[PDB]
């Protein structure tokens, strides 16, 4: 939890980052493309 | 406010050249010129403002020149103008262009700055630089006092460095009232930039895009590169009207293969098929190759229309314009470097673009004349499979190097830093955790002396740490060479039709302990054969990659000299030569290690990714423990650039990470426990 300690040490409480706590809470997941299949196959 | 302007070059006090005036006639017709006075009226009354105009408006070439003219009107010692570009090729190409436009030599009054490529001098008063390079200048110049105007261009691409620069500049203008900041973007983005700079003024250039007909496939394509080549040749043969082609692909190797296949299928009709000039465009091209995108198409004897086909990455989506392009082919994909913080995996990904990107690509078909855009997908795929907008890079990236640069900049509170789009807490956690493991931050999260010096290297923190720590292993000379080779494109040329021959040439360099030392073998051999083009061909070595590695190594070694970091080698006759280098690799890449499991696959330590050695590896056997440079996330997981390491080096060099009180149960932990208990027996 060494990264969560350094974060709460910075002043992080919970929820999103940013100067108003407005940031997304969870990371976005990017869908990868396999081989050269066209979009929507 | 009004300075004497005789009709001489103000940098030479000699008449302008004939070409200067020819170019000047054309740029007075750019859409931005109409607005020059309205721009000036804003510039002299406001500290920051936003300028929005479609690609092709004249933003990047003309606005920085107007800022130079503004700077020349101010009293005191002369300062410069900086204009940041997300894209290397845009910065270098446009700096050459604007040097011409200003009637000066590139690198004198007009220059550029890319990582490892500084083309500037004491005379430089206008500098196009990547946004990353401006953030690096801020580390040793926190208020950026070398510049009187800073222009953040292509802001709509929302790169990591641009987003950080926006927050850094927002703080700088609080401390400096003389500095002008200008944000330029192709799109309004719901006034996001204006709001962010405290509701600053906005100047909007009307667009001049001609109509563009869009065509969709009837059904999904099974191969988008095959569809791309097919579409290109049909456009070349079936369109009556003159006009050039712009095909969007996703990277350098994919582009080259397309360029070869287009030239063959086209050259497969000797007569009466129009000449086509095939031009690649991707991020690492030398200036001589970059500039080919601008030279004119072939001529029309029996009326066969001549055309250019530019086969390009999304460099060509908004960052420059190739006059004459009328047809765009849009497979609908781009390449992104994605970071998954939950498993600590970064990887190059090919992904579907956003509707926003698709509209820009199609817009490039309409700059010169009415155009056409061939989207290689169905309209329902456009409507239900493509997101409205691209995610800002900050939301899908590894923040390790950005956190390190912010801490170096003295920005300690990264939770409340004014990100336009703040990243997820977990991602910021992994960045802090990484920098702590590397001893760049201490347990309080404060920058250490090692951290501060790592930040001076324009390298991933893992590489910077490795370079610095290798001095203590008396092998920094060789780890420098390896670092330079890892900082440039693939050095092994492997043609589709000559795989065996390329692979046999590669094995001439293979080190028994793996890929990192093979790169050392290639670089050493390159140097001892005097940088020969012929020797590169003889050995299927990429001449451009090796010349680029040599430049990188030279520039890195100046950083070493500046910090008095010794450049050392061990006796080549001793066993410790290759053992010291392999140990040094662990100092930076101890988190990228995989263990050979009983059934022959690999398992990455802690994160437990099932992977296999990448097929391009020189390893002819499976070491029980491998350190790897790159995670490759295709149909299978591969680890690429792999070196045999001993597990006792993990516990001795990076015991904070190889902490057996949290290490998950696995075969790797069983071996490490045995090692650790033996050390204590
Ligand atoms: N490198 C170049 N060589 C020749 N012409 C160029 C070059 N760069 C730009 N131009 C000309 O300038 C025009 C507008 O350029 P630019 O300042 O880059 O626009 P923007 O940044 O708004 O998209 C281009 O359409 C082309 O006519
Ligand atoms: Mg531009």
UniProtKB/Swiss-Prot annotation, chain A:
Changing residue 38 to E: Decreased, but not abolished interaction, with DHX15. Residues 1-41 form the G-patch domain. This is NF-kappa-B-repressing factor. It is found in: Nucleus, Nucleolus. Changing residue 39 to E: Decreased, but not abolished interaction, with DHX15. Transmembrane segments: none annotated. Enhances the ATPase activity of DHX15 by acting like a brace that tethers mobile sections of DHX15 together, stabilizing a functional conformation with high RNA affinity of DHX15. Involved in the constitutive silencing of the interferon beta promoter, independently of the virus-induced signals, and in the inhibition of the basal and cytokine-induced iNOS promoter activity. Also involved in the regulation of IL-8 transcription. Widely and constitutively expressed. Expressed at lower level in colon, peripheral blood lymphocytes, lung and kidney. It comes from Homo sapiens (Human). Interacts with NF-kappa-B. Interacts with XRN2. Interacts (via G-patch domain) with DHX15; promoting the RNA helicase activity of DHX15.
UniProtKB/Swiss-Prot annotation, chain B:
It comes from the Eukaryota. Changing residue 381 to E: Decreased, but not abolished interaction, with NKRF. It is an enzyme of class 3 (hydrolase). It is found in: Nucleus; Nucleus, Nucleolus. Ubiquitous. Pfam families: DEAD, HA2_C, HA2_N, Helicase_C, OB_NTP_bind. One of its GO terms (molecular function) is double-stranded RNA binding. InterPro entries: DEAD-box_helicase_OB_fold, DEAD/DEAH_box_helicase_dom, DHX15_DEXHc, DNA/RNA_helicase_DEAH_CS, HA2_WH, Helicase-assoc_dom, Helicase_ATP-bd, Helicase_C-like. One of its GO terms (cellular component) is spliceosomal complex. Its EC number is 3.6.4.13. SUPFAM superfamilies: P-loop containing nucleoside triphosphate hydrolases. Residues 40-206 form the Helicase ATP-binding domain. PANTHER family: ATP-DEPENDENT RNA HELICASE, ATP-DEPENDENT RNA HELICASE DHX15. Component of the U11/U12 snRNPs that are part of the U12-type spliceosome. Identified in the Intron Large spliceosome complex (IL, also named intron lariat spliceosome), a post-mRNA release spliceosomal complex containing the excised intron, U2, U5 and U6 snRNPs, and splicing factors; the association may be transient. The IL complex exists in two distinct conformations, one with the DHX15 (ILS2) and one without (ILS1). Interacts with TFIP11 (via G-patch domain); indicative for a recruitment to the IL complex. Interacts with SSB/La. RNA helicase involved in mRNA processing and antiviral innate immunity. Pre-mRNA processing factor involved in disassembly of spliceosomes after the release of mature mRNA. In cooperation with TFIP11 seem to be involved in the transition of the U2, U5 and U6 snRNP-containing IL complex to the snRNP-free IS complex leading to efficient debranching and turnover of excised introns. Plays a key role in antiviral innate immunity by promoting both MAVS-dependent signaling and NLRP6 inflammasome. This is ATP-dependent RNA helicase DHX15. It comes from Homo sapiens. The gene is DHX15.
């Amino acid at each position: 939890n060494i990264g969560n300690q350094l974060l709460r040490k910075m002043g992080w409480t919970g929820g999103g980052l940013g100067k108003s706590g407005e940031g997304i809470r969870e990371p976005i997941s990017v869908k990868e493309q396999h081989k050269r299949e066209g979009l929507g196959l | 406010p009004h300075m004497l302007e005789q009709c001489i070059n103000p940098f030479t006090n000699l008449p302008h050249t004939p070409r200067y005036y020819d170019i000047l006639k054309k740029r007075l017709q750019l859409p931005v010129w109409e607005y020059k006075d309205r721009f000036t009226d804003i510039l002299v009354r406001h500290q920051s403002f936003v300028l929005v105009g479609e690609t092709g408006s004249g933003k990047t070439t003309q606005i920085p020149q107007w800022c130079v003219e503004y700077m020349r009107s101010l009293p005191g010692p002369k300062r410069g103008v900086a204009c940041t570009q997300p894209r290397r090729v845009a910065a270098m190409s446009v700096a050459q262009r604007v040097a011409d436009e200003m009637d000066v030599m590139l690198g004198q009054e007009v220059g550029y700055s890319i990582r490892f490529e500084d083309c500037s001098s004491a005379k430089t008063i206008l500098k196009y630089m990547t946004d990353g390079m401006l953030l690096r200048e801020a580390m040793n110049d926190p208020l950026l006092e070398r510049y009187g105007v800073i222009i953040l261009d292509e802001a709509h691409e929302r790169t990591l460095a641009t987003d950080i620069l926006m927050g850094v500049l927002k703080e700088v203008v609080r401390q400096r009232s003389d500095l002008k900041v200008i944000v330029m973007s192709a799109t309004l983005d719901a006034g996001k930039f204006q709001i962010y700079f405290d509701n600053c003024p906005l100047l909007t250039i009307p667009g001049r895009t001609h109509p563009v007909e869009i065509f969709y496939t009837p059904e999904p394509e099974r191969d988008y590169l095959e569809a791309a080549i097919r579409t290109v040749i049909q456009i070349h043969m079936c369109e009556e009207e003159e006009g050039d082609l712009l095909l969007f692909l996703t990277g350098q190797e994919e582009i080259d293969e397309a360029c070869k296949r287009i030239k063959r299928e086209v050259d497969d009709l000797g007569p009466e098929v129009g000449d086509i000039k095939i031009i690649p465009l991707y991020s690492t091209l030398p200036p001589q190759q970059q500039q080919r995108i601008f030279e004119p198409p072939p001529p029309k004897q029996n009326g066969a229309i001549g055309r250019k086909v530019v086969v390009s990455t999304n460099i060509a989506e908004t960052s420059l314009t190739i006059d004459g392009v009328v047809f765009v082919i849009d497979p609908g994909f781009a390449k992104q470097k994605v970071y998954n913080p939950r498993i600590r995996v970064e990887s190059l990904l090919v992904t579907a673009i956003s509707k926003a990107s698709a509209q820009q690509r199609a817009g490039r078909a309409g700059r010169t004349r009415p155009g056409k855009c061939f989207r290689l997908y169905t309209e329902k795929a456009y409507k239900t499979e493509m997101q409205d907008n691209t995610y800002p890079e900050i939301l899908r990236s590894n923040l390790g190097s950005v956190v390190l640069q912010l801490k170096k900049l003295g920005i300690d509170d990264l939770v409340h830093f004014d990100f336009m789009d703040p990243p997820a807490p977990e991602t910021l956690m992994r960045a802090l955790e990484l920098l702590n493991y590397l001893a760049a931050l201490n347990d309080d999260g404060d920058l250490t002396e090692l951290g501060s010096m790592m930040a001076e290297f324009p390298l991933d923190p893992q590489l910077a740490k490795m370079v610095i720590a290798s001095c203590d292993y008396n092998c920094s000379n060789e780890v420098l060479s390896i670092t330079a080779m890892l900082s440039v494109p693939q050095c092994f040329v492997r043609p589709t039709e000559a795989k065996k021959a390329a692979d046999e040439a590669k094995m001439r360099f293979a080190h028994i302990d793996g890929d990192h030392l093979t790169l050392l073998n290639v670089y050493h051999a390159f140097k001892q054969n005097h940088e020969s083009v012929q020797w590169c061909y003889d050995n299927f070595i990429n001449y451009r990659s090796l010349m680029s590695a040599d430049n990188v190594r030279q520039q890195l070694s100046r950083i070493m000299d500046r910090f008095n970091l010794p450049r050392r080698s061990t006796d080549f006759t001793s066993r410790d030569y290759y053992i010291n280098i392999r140990k040094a690799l662990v100092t930076g890449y101890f988190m990228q290690v995989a263990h050979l499991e009983r059934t022959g696959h690999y398992l990455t330590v802690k994160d437990n990714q099932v992977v296999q050695l990448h097929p391009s590896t020189v390893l002819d056997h499976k070491p029980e423990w491998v350190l790897y440079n790159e995670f490759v996330l295709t149909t299978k997981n591969y680890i690429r650039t792999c070196t045999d390491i001993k597990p006792e080096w993990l516990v001795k060099i990076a015991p904070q990470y190889y902490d057996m009180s949290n290490f998950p149960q696995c075969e790797a932990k069983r071996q490490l426990d045995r090692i650790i208990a033996k050390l204590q027996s």
